[PDB]
């Protein structure tokens, strides 16, 4: 059930994320999901080094200019658009790296939803985000935020430690949960991909039905 | 196996009668290989009619 547009910009499995530019002429920018792999801190350093090696542009330097401009405010600029039918390009309003994908079950529930999970660290100098994507079977939001509070207690401790050690600096949240649609339990498969003659470890989701959610802030 | 089963009471003595007066008194169904073992073992009693 395709609902398409045209988006002024090789795999079909990409999530166009519309991030807001601090510069005033574009007012926004369409970054794909793989370039949060370079800002994530849960990821392996080798895959981060590979994506830093392949994708240096002037717009990548402006991307690091305008995402690290305002820290702990990235959820005010985070905005998804759905999946790619073909790559100017189009996007409907699934390729995932191996370490940014995680599951807290035996992933043996038949119908399972997907969920973008981000977290905000504070125990270092300022802020290190960690990008996740959570394939889970829970449908209701409160039970999901209970198991997220159960699985991410150290980030809550870091949140309250930032609120007690830097009183002039105000945080906003500890992260974002947001659904995107569902894949079944059988087409999820550890897999392989080579882009521009490079080895990168990818796990794929095949039968996706796109159905978005909202960026629900939680603690 | 034949004499252990009780006969039914919805009895139709017109249907399922062979030529030369033999009345059918049951059906014995199995797979390919068990039936061909029965045929290769008990071939003397088989009357293909």
């Amino acid at each position: 059930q395709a609902l398409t547009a045209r988006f002024f910009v090789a795999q079909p499995g990409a999530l166009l994320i519309r991030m807001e530019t601090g510069c005033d002429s574009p007012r926004h920018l369409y970054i794909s999901l793989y370039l949060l792999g370079i800002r994530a801190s849960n990821v392996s350093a080798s895959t981060r080094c590979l994506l830093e090696s392949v994708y240096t542009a002037s717009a990548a330097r402006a991307a690091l200019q305008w995402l690290d401009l305002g820290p702990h405010l990235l959820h005010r600029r985070l905005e998804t658009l759905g999946c790619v039918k073909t790559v100017l390009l189009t996007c409907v309003m699934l390729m995932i790296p191996k370490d940014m994908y995680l599951t807290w079950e035996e992933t043996r529930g038949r119908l399972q939803y997907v969920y973008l999970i981000i977290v905000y660290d504070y125990d270092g100098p300022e802020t290190r985000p960690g990008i996740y994507v959570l394939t889970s079977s829970i449908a209701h939001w409160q039970t999901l935020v209970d198991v997220a509070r159960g699985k991410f207690a150290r980030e809550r401790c870091s949140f309250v430690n930032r609120r007690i050690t830097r009183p002039r600096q105000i945080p906003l949240c500890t992260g974002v949960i947001q659904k995107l649609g569902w894949c079944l339990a059988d087409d999820i498969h550890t897999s392989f991909l080579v882009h521009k003659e490079l080895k990168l470890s990818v796990v794929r989701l095949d039968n996706f039905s796109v159905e978005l959610g909202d960026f629900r802030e939680f603690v | 196996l034949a004499e252990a089963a009780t006969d039914s009471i919805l009895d139709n003595p017109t249907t399922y009668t062979t030529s030369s007066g033999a009345k059918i008194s049951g059906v014995m169904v199995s797979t390919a290989n068990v039936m061909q073992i029965i045929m290769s073992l008990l071939s003397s009693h088989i009357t293909k009619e």
Partner: protein, 49 residues
């Protein structure tokens, strides 16, 4: 909970029978779902309401 009066009053079709075990053994050992074993003679089939 059934209408056994309809079983005892309505006109019936006859059958040749062959039970598996004895009939009273088929009564006391619950082979069917609904049974109405009364000994002697019961006049319960007459109060037509």
């Amino acid at each position: 909970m059934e209408n056994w009066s309809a079983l005892e009053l309505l006109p019936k079709v006859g059958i040749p029978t062959d039970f598996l075990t004895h009939v009273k053994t088929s009564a006391g050992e619950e082979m069917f779902e609904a049974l109405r074993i009364y000994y002697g003679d019961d006049p319960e089939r007459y109060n037509i309401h």
